[model samples]
Target: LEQRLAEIWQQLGGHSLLLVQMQQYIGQQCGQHVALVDLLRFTTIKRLAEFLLA
Candidate 1:
C-alpha cells in the first residue's frame, strides 16, 4: 500500500494544489514528515479543496 500510495502521489501530483497536498498527505501517512502547507502558499483556495472531493 505504501508503494501504491507513493505511485499515486507521483502520478497525480503537479497538476493541482489539491493533488500536491494529497501527495504530501500520503507521504505523511507513509511516515514522512511532510508539512501540509509546504507548497500551499502558492495555491488558490478552491484548488486545495478540490482533492477533498477526489
Candidate 2:
C-alpha cells in the first residue's frame, strides 16, 4: 500500500523525481494555489523535485 511504501521511502531516504513532477503538474493545473512552503517544511517526493529544480 501507499503508506507502507512511503514508510519504506522514509527509512531508506528514497527520492522519486516523479513525485516532484506530479506536484508541479497538479499545482499548475489548480491554476491558483498557495506555496507549499506556507504549509509544510519537509518535502514530499514531488515537492522535493520542484524545490531542487527551482
Candidate 3:
C-alpha cells in the first residue's frame, strides 16, 4: 500500500508536505511513532516497512 503510494508520489516529483502527511498517517495507523529522521534514513517505502516491522 505504502509502496504503491510512494511510487505515485515519486512519479509526481516528490512532495515534501505530502510525504510528511504520509508519515503522520502511517504512524497513527501503525500505532508507532515515526520520526522524520527515520524517513530520511529509510527513504524508500520498502525499507521503511522493514524498519516498522523491525
Predicted model with the maximum TM-score:
3
Ranking by lDDT: 3, 1, 2
Residues 1-54 of candidate 1: C-alpha lDDT, one tens digit per residue: 444544554562345547455655655556664466554443333444344324
Task: Report how far residue 44 has shifted in candidate 3, in Å.
Answer: 2.0
Collision count for each candidate, in order: 0, 3, 0
Candidate 3 runs further than 4 Å off: 1-14
Worst window of 10 by summed lDDT in candidate 3: 5-14
Q: Write the per-residue lDDT of candidate 2 for residues 1-54, one digit (tens) a residue.
A: 244334434551434553454346445544534454432445454454356435
Alpha-carbon lDDT, every model: 0.48, 0.44, 0.59
Which prediction has more favorable TM-score, 2 or 3? 3
lDDT of 3 by residue, 11-54 (tens): 52345676677666666546665677666654556555556657
Give TM-scores for every candidate, taking all chains together and pairing residue i with residue i.
Answer: 0.26, 0.27, 0.44
lDDT for 35 (candidate 3)? 71
RMSD per model, one decimal: 10.4, 9.5, 4.5
Question: In lDDT terms, which candidate is top?
Answer: 3
Candidate 3: give the clashing pairs: none
